[PDB]
Design a protein around this ligand. Structure first.
Ligand SMILES: *[C@@H]1O[C@H](CO)[C@@H](O)[C@H](O)[C@H]1NC(C)=O
Ligand SMILES: *[C@@H]1O[C@H](CO)[C@@H](O)[C@H](O)[C@H]1NC(C)=O
Lengths: 107, 122, 295, 99, 104
């Protein structure tokens, strides 16, 4: 009941990135994505693994298939990238993603 | 909308830190509070959830500080007492607003509380 | 240093046949199970599939292995997924208001895990009380197969207009998802203190020290002496050896049976042998009736 | 006969009366079947008494003496010694009691 | 169940004399070749012990006599038997010998 993320993803502006949340054995169709800016409280991007809390960019999407839950960003901005987290719920210990620092090139 | 934490706590290992998560901007009794630890440069780590109406303090077993989450309903402030402190407990302790429902979302949090657990004094 | 030597294991508190029981009684009729005369056992629960939740109300979960309990009933039952909410003090809900109801004064557990991995089939034997005319009294159950009577028209043991059988079943669909998965859920009944220790916290046995002046506690027997090996041979049921003075003499190490002597510390009197202070200020100290080490 | 304690159990009830149990069986047609073999046993009631206990050299009570058995045993009890040396010993006093 | 056979007779209880008997160890403490003295419940020596009868045969043909009464516990109880072929198992110890109290 522990979930796996890719530690890093580097992409370019306008290009589509997908960051995976890979949970061991069974998964729960709810998941929660978090963008942690450096030295700042992570902020929930994706709720239920399918929805954004209000005000969050339309480029921020989420999903899951099998045991994986994706953090999918379309058309990045160099303002956008940050450390990304996903969450495991209903399992008692809430294992949050190891975190993924997103880099955006082209600067 | 507002979760304000007691400032950084520097202890010797084995001592106790208790940290205040002060609610404002919403109803305390209608929301559990998640307590989230980020070890410096390390991932998000969730120590437990608390209930406003009750002592529903679940505890994750990854580390052990004999922790108990107390919520002060008059001041809407959930405390996290982290005892048996270790140099690895050094981290930024977030408290996170949770649903009172069986669902688990943390939309809004505290500002985080660094705790430096060391024999090194400030 | 001190030796606290409580016996080996002294039993373990069995909630595994409550958590691991093959066929759970369903939520609508919940088990109430005596765990007693044992030692708090959270140590089987460390290596496990992982209970989908762990909530035990009363006191700190490290007081589980530090604090003994009295009437210990770990409640073995299967509930539908969202119903862990519905199992708690002060819950308005289907589980609480009807089939499985817990007190506002209950000190103990509510713990979830998915049995969709097991209890799922098509199993309609699983059942629940969808409606009942009050809340169950503390730890009370409602067994009623009686007709739920909606109108003043008596149903008389057959179906009719708004004639209901109040208990109902959960169809378990092997495609069940996180909302539709059953959760086997367990509840530890206990009064904390105020009654004898049945879940007696694993009581720390400090490592046994031998051939050294120590301050020892053996199974509640306290004393300070020099613990040594000894050849005197007990009868099996016995506990303390003694002496003519009734003073404790020999003991038996509980965790591994062995016959330990006891003995006084060096004691004796100090004696200052001196020539007259008129001759010298030098003195020779005599420690009486000791062996020359502890000096 | 020295009797070790088997189990010391939390009972907490007062037991004022009892009866033993039996094992019998069934027989088949001979001139219902019941009453296997013969059965007899011994029963006596306990009572507070002061015994001197002579646990053997390797342990185990090998001999015991009641004090209030007869003024005769009271001397071994009062002496606290099994071998009663030739002589006169003063056992506990007696009193006449009021009618 | 509660199949019952009660027969009739008691007879005068055949008594006996426990010479040296009923001395247990009233402690776990190991002692060696010492004279220890306590005042505790015992069966005092040279006492009256009732040698009871059950499934008893007094020969003509058969005539098995089931006498075993419900007996008071009083202060404490001693018990002894031979029974090369066991016919004895346990005891019913209690108070009401019924519900309303516990039962041993
Ligand atoms: C004892 O000491 C005194 C000085 O304090 C000295 O005058 C005297 O001679 C001494 N006597 C002996 C016997 O040592
Ligand atoms: C003192 O101890 C030594 C060994 O530690 C032993 O050989 C000796 O007999 C002891 N003597 C006394 C007086 O206890």
């Amino acid at each position: 009941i522990v979930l796996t993320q890719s530690p890093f993803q580097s992409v370019s502006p306008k290009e589509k990135v997908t960051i995976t949340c890979r949970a061991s054995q069974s998964i729960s169709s709810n998941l929660h994505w978090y963008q942690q800016k450096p030295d700042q409280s992570p902020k929930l991007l994706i709720k239920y693994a399918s929805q954004s809390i209000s005000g969050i960019p339309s480029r921020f999407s989420g999903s899951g298939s099998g045991t994986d839950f994706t953090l999918t960003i379309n058309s990045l901005e160099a303002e956008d990238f940050g450390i990304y987290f996903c969450q495991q719920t209903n399992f008692w210990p809430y294992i949050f993603g190891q975190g993924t620092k997103l880099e955006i090139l082209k600067r | 909308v507002q979760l304000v934490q007691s400032g950084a706590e520097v202890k010797k290992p084995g001592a106790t830190v208790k940290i205040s998560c002060k609610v404002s901007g919403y109803s305390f009794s209608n929301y559990y509070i998640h307590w989230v630890k980020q070890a410096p440069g390390k991932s998000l780590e969730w120590i437990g959830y608390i209930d406003p109406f009750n002592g529903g303090t679940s505890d994750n077993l990854k580390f052990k500080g004999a922790a108990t989450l107390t919520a002060d309903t008059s001041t809407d402030t959930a405390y996290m007492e982290l005892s048996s402190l270790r140099s690895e407990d050094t981290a930024v302790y977030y408290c996170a607003r949770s649903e009172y429902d069986p669902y688990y979302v943390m939309d809004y949090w505290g500002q985080g509380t660094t705790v430096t657990v060391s024999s090194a004094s400030t | 240093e001190s030796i606290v030597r409580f016996p080996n294991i002294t039993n373990l508190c069995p909630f595994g046949e409550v958590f691991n029981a093959t066929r759970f009684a369903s939520v609508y009729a919940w088990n109430r199970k005596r765990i007693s005369n044992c030692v708090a056992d959270y140590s089987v629960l460390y290596n496990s599939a992982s209970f989908s939740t762990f909530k035990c109300y009363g006191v700190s979960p490290t007081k589980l292995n530090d604090l003994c309990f009295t009437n210990v009933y770990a409640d073995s039952f299967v509930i539908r997924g969202d119903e862990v909410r519905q199992i708690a003090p002060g819950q308005t809900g289907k589980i609480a208001d009807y089939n499985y109801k817990l007190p506002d004064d209950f000190t103990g557990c509510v713990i979830a895990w998915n049995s969709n991995n097991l209890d799922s089939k098509g199993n309609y034997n699983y059942l629940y009380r969808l409606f009942r005319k009050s809340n169950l009294k503390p730890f009370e159950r409602d067994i009623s197969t009686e007709i739920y009577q909606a109108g003043s028209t008596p149903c008389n043991g057959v179906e009719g207009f708004n004639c209901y059988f109040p208990l109902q079943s959960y169809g378990f669909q092997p495609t069940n998802g996180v909302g539709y998965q059953p959760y086997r859920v367990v509840v530890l009944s206990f009064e904390l203190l105020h009654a004898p220790a049945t879940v007696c916290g694993p009581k720390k046995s400090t490592n046994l020290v031998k051939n050294k002046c120590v301050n020892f506690n053996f199974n509640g027997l306290t004393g300070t002496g020099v613990l040594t090996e000894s050849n005197k041979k007990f009868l099996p049921f016995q506990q303390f050896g003694r002496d003519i003075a009734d003073t404790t003499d020999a003991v038996r190490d509980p965790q591994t049976l062995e016959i330990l002597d006891i003995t006084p510390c060096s004691f004796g009197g100090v004696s200052v042998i001196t020539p007259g202070t008129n001759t010298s200020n030098q003195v020779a100290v005599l420690y009486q009736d000791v062996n020359c080490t502890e000096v | 006969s020295a009797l070790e304690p088997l189990v010391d159990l939390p009972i907490g009830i007062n037991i004022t009366r009892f009866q033993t149990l039996l094992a019998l069986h069934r027989s088949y047609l001979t001139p219902s079947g019941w009453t296997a073999g013969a059965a007899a046993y011994y029963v006596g009631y306990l009572q507070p008494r002061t015994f001197l206990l002579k646990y053997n050299e390797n342990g185990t009570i090998t001999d015991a003496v009641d004090c209030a058995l007869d003024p005769l045993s009271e001397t071994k009890c009062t002496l606290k010694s099994f071998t009663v040396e030739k002589g006169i010993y003063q056992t506990s006093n007696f009193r006449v009691q009021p009618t | 169940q509660c199949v019952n056979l009660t027969t009739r007779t008691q007879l005068p209880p055949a008594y006996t004399n426990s010479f040296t008997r009923g001395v247990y160890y009233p402690d776990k403490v190991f002692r060696s070749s010492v004279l220890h003295s306590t005042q505790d419940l015992f069966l005092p020596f040279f006492s009256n012990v009732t040698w009871f009868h059950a499934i008893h045969v007094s020969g003509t043909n058969g005539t098995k006599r089931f006498d075993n009464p419900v007996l008071p516990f009083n202060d404490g109880v001693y018990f002894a038997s031979t029974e090369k072929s066991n016919i004895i198992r346990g005891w019913i110890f209690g108070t009401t010998l019924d519900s309303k109290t516990q039962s041993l």
